[PDB]
Scaffold this motif. Sequence first.
Motif, PDB file in Angstrom:
ATOM      1  N   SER A  68      -9.809 -10.237   4.246  1.00  0.00           N
ATOM      2  CA  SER A  68      -8.659 -10.969   4.751  1.00  0.00           C
ATOM      3  C   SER A  68      -7.407 -10.111   4.719  1.00  0.00           C
ATOM      4  O   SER A  68      -6.591 -10.159   5.648  1.00  0.00           O
ATOM      5  N   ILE A  69      -7.234  -9.326   3.654  1.00  0.00           N
ATOM      6  CA  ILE A  69      -6.090  -8.424   3.589  1.00  0.00           C
ATOM      7  C   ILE A  69      -6.137  -7.421   4.727  1.00  0.00           C
ATOM      8  O   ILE A  69      -5.122  -7.152   5.374  1.00  0.00           O
ATOM      9  N   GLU A  70      -7.325  -6.883   5.016  1.00  0.00           N
ATOM     10  CA  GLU A  70      -7.429  -5.911   6.092  1.00  0.00           C
ATOM     11  C   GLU A  70      -7.061  -6.552   7.423  1.00  0.00           C
ATOM     12  O   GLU A  70      -6.486  -5.890   8.285  1.00  0.00           O
TER      13      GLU A  70
ATOM     14  N   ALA B  40       4.853  -4.035  10.047  1.00  0.00           N
ATOM     15  CA  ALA B  40       5.707  -4.760   9.114  1.00  0.00           C
ATOM     16  C   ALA B  40       6.506  -3.792   8.251  1.00  0.00           C
ATOM     17  O   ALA B  40       5.961  -2.825   7.714  1.00  0.00           O
ATOM     18  N   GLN B  41       7.803  -4.056   8.115  1.00  0.00           N
ATOM     19  CA  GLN B  41       8.676  -3.213   7.307  1.00  0.00           C
ATOM     20  C   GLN B  41       9.010  -3.804   5.947  1.00  0.00           C
ATOM     21  O   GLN B  41       9.319  -3.053   5.018  1.00  0.00           O
ATOM     22  N   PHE B  42       8.976  -5.124   5.805  1.00  0.00           N
ATOM     23  CA  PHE B  42       9.231  -5.778   4.534  1.00  0.00           C
ATOM     24  C   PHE B  42       8.071  -6.717   4.290  1.00  0.00           C
ATOM     25  O   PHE B  42       7.705  -7.487   5.181  1.00  0.00           O
ATOM     26  N   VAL B  43       7.474  -6.633   3.107  1.00  0.00           N
ATOM     27  CA  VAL B  43       6.361  -7.497   2.744  1.00  0.00           C
ATOM     28  C   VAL B  43       6.759  -8.247   1.484  1.00  0.00           C
ATOM     29  O   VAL B  43       7.105  -7.629   0.469  1.00  0.00           O
ATOM     30  N   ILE B  44       6.741  -9.567   1.556  1.00  0.00           N
ATOM     31  CA  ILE B  44       7.208 -10.413   0.464  1.00  0.00           C
ATOM     32  C   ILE B  44       5.990 -11.060  -0.174  1.00  0.00           C
ATOM     33  O   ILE B  44       5.275 -11.804   0.503  1.00  0.00           O
ATOM     34  N   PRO B  45       5.723 -10.813  -1.448  1.00  0.00           N
ATOM     35  CA  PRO B  45       4.620 -11.496  -2.129  1.00  0.00           C
ATOM     36  C   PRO B  45       5.033 -12.907  -2.510  1.00  0.00           C
ATOM     37  O   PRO B  45       6.213 -13.268  -2.505  1.00  0.00           O
ATOM     38  N   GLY B  46       4.031 -13.723  -2.830  1.00  0.00           N
ATOM     39  CA  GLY B  46       4.341 -15.066  -3.277  1.00  0.00           C
ATOM     40  C   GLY B  46       5.103 -15.094  -4.587  1.00  0.00           C
ATOM     41  O   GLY B  46       5.854 -16.034  -4.851  1.00  0.00           O
ATOM     42  N   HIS B  47       4.920 -14.072  -5.424  1.00  0.00           N
ATOM     43  CA  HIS B  47       5.600 -13.964  -6.712  1.00  0.00           C
ATOM     44  C   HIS B  47       6.038 -12.527  -6.903  1.00  0.00           C
ATOM     45  O   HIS B  47       5.212 -11.614  -6.835  1.00  0.00           O
ATOM     46  N   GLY B  48       7.322 -12.323  -7.140  1.00  0.00           N
ATOM     47  CA  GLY B  48       7.791 -11.017  -7.545  1.00  0.00           C
ATOM     48  C   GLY B  48       8.470 -10.237  -6.440  1.00  0.00           C
ATOM     49  O   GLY B  48       8.921 -10.768  -5.424  1.00  0.00           O
TER      50      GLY B  48
ATOM     51  N   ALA C 294      -1.466 -14.616  -1.372  1.00  0.00           N
ATOM     52  CA  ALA C 294      -2.533 -13.680  -1.052  1.00  0.00           C
ATOM     53  C   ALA C 294      -2.138 -12.234  -1.290  1.00  0.00           C
ATOM     54  O   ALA C 294      -3.023 -11.375  -1.297  1.00  0.00           O
ATOM     55  N   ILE C 295      -0.849 -11.937  -1.467  1.00  0.00           N
ATOM     56  CA  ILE C 295      -0.365 -10.580  -1.677  1.00  0.00           C
ATOM     57  C   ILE C 295       0.344 -10.544  -3.016  1.00  0.00           C
ATOM     58  O   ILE C 295       1.214 -11.382  -3.284  1.00  0.00           O
ATOM     59  N   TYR C 296      -0.009  -9.567  -3.840  1.00  0.00           N
ATOM     60  CA  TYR C 296       0.565  -9.401  -5.164  1.00  0.00           C
ATOM     61  C   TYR C 296       1.708  -8.394  -5.128  1.00  0.00           C
ATOM     62  O   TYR C 296       1.657  -7.401  -4.396  1.00  0.00           O
ATOM     63  N   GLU C 297       2.724  -8.631  -5.957  1.00  0.00           N
ATOM     64  CA  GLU C 297       3.721  -7.592  -6.166  1.00  0.00           C
ATOM     65  C   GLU C 297       3.115  -6.413  -6.919  1.00  0.00           C
ATOM     66  O   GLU C 297       2.085  -6.531  -7.589  1.00  0.00           O
ATOM     67  N   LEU C 298       3.792  -5.265  -6.812  1.00  0.00           N
ATOM     68  CA  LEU C 298       3.279  -4.037  -7.406  1.00  0.00           C
ATOM     69  C   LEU C 298       3.137  -4.168  -8.912  1.00  0.00           C
ATOM     70  O   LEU C 298       2.195  -3.628  -9.501  1.00  0.00           O
TER      71      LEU C 298
ATOM     72  N   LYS D 291      -2.862  -2.876   0.032  1.00  0.00           N
ATOM     73  CA  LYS D 291      -3.919  -2.130  -0.626  1.00  0.00           C
ATOM     74  C   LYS D 291      -3.809  -2.275  -2.133  1.00  0.00           C
ATOM     75  O   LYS D 291      -4.828  -2.312  -2.834  1.00  0.00           O
ATOM     76  N   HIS D 292      -2.586  -2.398  -2.647  1.00  0.00           N
ATOM     77  CA  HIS D 292      -2.418  -2.671  -4.067  1.00  0.00           C
ATOM     78  C   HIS D 292      -3.137  -3.962  -4.450  1.00  0.00           C
ATOM     79  O   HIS D 292      -3.884  -4.013  -5.433  1.00  0.00           O
ATOM     80  N   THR D 293      -2.920  -5.025  -3.676  1.00  0.00           N
ATOM     81  CA  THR D 293      -3.591  -6.290  -3.958  1.00  0.00           C
ATOM     82  C   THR D 293      -5.102  -6.137  -3.886  1.00  0.00           C
ATOM     83  O   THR D 293      -5.824  -6.636  -4.758  1.00  0.00           O
ATOM     84  N   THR D 294      -5.597  -5.437  -2.868  1.00  0.00           N
ATOM     85  CA  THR D 294      -7.029  -5.197  -2.762  1.00  0.00           C
ATOM     86  C   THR D 294      -7.565  -4.504  -4.004  1.00  0.00           C
ATOM     87  O   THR D 294      -8.624  -4.870  -4.520  1.00  0.00           O
ATOM     88  N   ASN D 295      -6.833  -3.510  -4.512  1.00  0.00           N
ATOM     89  CA  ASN D 295      -7.284  -2.811  -5.708  1.00  0.00           C
ATOM     90  C   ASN D 295      -7.364  -3.754  -6.898  1.00  0.00           C
ATOM     91  O   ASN D 295      -8.342  -3.730  -7.650  1.00  0.00           O
ATOM     92  N   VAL D 296      -6.350  -4.604  -7.074  1.00  0.00           N
ATOM     93  CA  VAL D 296      -6.357  -5.525  -8.203  1.00  0.00           C
ATOM     94  C   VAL D 296      -7.490  -6.530  -8.056  1.00  0.00           C
ATOM     95  O   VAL D 296      -8.188  -6.855  -9.023  1.00  0.00           O
ATOM     96  N   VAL D 297      -7.677  -7.054  -6.845  1.00  0.00           N
ATOM     97  CA  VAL D 297      -8.715  -8.047  -6.602  1.00  0.00           C
ATOM     98  C   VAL D 297     -10.093  -7.452  -6.855  1.00  0.00           C
ATOM     99  O   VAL D 297     -10.943  -8.076  -7.498  1.00  0.00           O
ATOM    100  N   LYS D 298     -10.332  -6.226  -6.381  1.00  0.00           N
ATOM    101  CA  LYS D 298     -11.630  -5.600  -6.630  1.00  0.00           C
ATOM    102  C   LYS D 298     -11.863  -5.326  -8.108  1.00  0.00           C
ATOM    103  O   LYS D 298     -12.984  -5.496  -8.599  1.00  0.00           O
ATOM    104  N   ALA D 299     -10.824  -4.903  -8.832  1.00  0.00           N
ATOM    105  CA  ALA D 299     -10.994  -4.705 -10.265  1.00  0.00           C
ATOM    106  C   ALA D 299     -11.391  -6.010 -10.944  1.00  0.00           C
ATOM    107  O   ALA D 299     -12.286  -6.034 -11.797  1.00  0.00           O
ATOM    108  N   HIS D 300     -10.761  -7.115 -10.551  1.00  0.00           N
ATOM    109  CA  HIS D 300     -11.136  -8.399 -11.132  1.00  0.00           C
ATOM    110  C   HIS D 300     -12.545  -8.794 -10.718  1.00  0.00           C
ATOM    111  O   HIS D 300     -13.330  -9.294 -11.536  1.00  0.00           O
ATOM    112  N   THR D 301     -12.880  -8.579  -9.449  1.00  0.00           N
ATOM    113  CA  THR D 301     -14.224  -8.872  -8.957  1.00  0.00           C
ATOM    114  C   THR D 301     -15.284  -8.212  -9.818  1.00  0.00           C
ATOM    115  O   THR D 301     -16.331  -8.810 -10.098  1.00  0.00           O
ATOM    116  N   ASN D 302     -15.028  -6.982 -10.243  1.00  0.00           N
ATOM    117  CA  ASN D 302     -15.999  -6.179 -10.968  1.00  0.00           C
ATOM    118  C   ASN D 302     -15.871  -6.312 -12.474  1.00  0.00           C
ATOM    119  O   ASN D 302     -16.482  -5.520 -13.201  1.00  0.00           O
TER     120      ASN D 302
END
Length: 234
Positions: free
Chosen positions: A191-193, A202-210, A168-172, A219-230
């Motif tokens: 869901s991200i919110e 949280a001090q360390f956030v680990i994405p599923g990949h990367g 659910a969370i993307y690397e940068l 918020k990075h993931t939200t930005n990518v998801v919204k760009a894909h949505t649109n």
Amino acid sequence: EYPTVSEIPVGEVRLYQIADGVWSHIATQSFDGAVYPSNGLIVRDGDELLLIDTAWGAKNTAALLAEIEKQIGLPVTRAVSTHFHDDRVGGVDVLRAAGVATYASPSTRRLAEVEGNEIPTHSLEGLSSSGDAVRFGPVELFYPGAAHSTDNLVVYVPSASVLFGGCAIYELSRTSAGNVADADLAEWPTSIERIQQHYPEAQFVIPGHGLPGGLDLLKHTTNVVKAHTNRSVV
Ligand SMILES: C[C@H](CS)C(=O)N1CCC[C@H]1C(=O)O
Ligand SMILES: [Mg+2]
Ligand SMILES: [Zn+2]
Ligand SMILES: [Zn+2]
């Protein structure tokens, strides 16, 4: 210093210490001619280990167990799969054969069964409604709502301030949507919110990949998801 996809041959697993008693595990697979890394978590649970996610396949997961035994030397007694895809349940049978009690939510177990994937043995109750959280030893399991998948869980290690966001969370470095075949694009930002609101410390956030990061990954993931949505179909 975090292991990258080019430093891990398929079939091998690396462990990376994030904090005291918290590691990520990193494995790779080839898909369509590209090679992808995948992260899971290992959390010290007294004198045992709790594993979050397989290493993406039976061979990688056998390597994961051998690497854990070599480098940490404590038994993996329980594993939680954070959603139903093969980077999370592929290798469940290997874990089960090694005496690991495998766990997933009923929603993950039903989706894994539909997909024909491996199915963790035990069911995690109390996670069916968005915002639900349950304790599981040294972690909290949180269902933020549908995002990358309808069943996706995130895992928080309160002692270490480590949030495993899973897929659910993307690397940068990911600036376009990944696998969204099972996603809920409409709900993913909400869901991200919920994750932000539940784990703002949280001090360390680990994405599923990367590569790991901080809460900025949300918020990075939200930005990518919204760009894909649109995305525009012309
Ligand atoms: C097997 C994983 C489950 S999240 C996957 O679909 N991946 C890994 C990252 C991209 C995307 C793909 O199909 O390659
Ligand atoms: Mg970004
Ligand atoms: Zn997935
Ligand atoms: Zn994934």
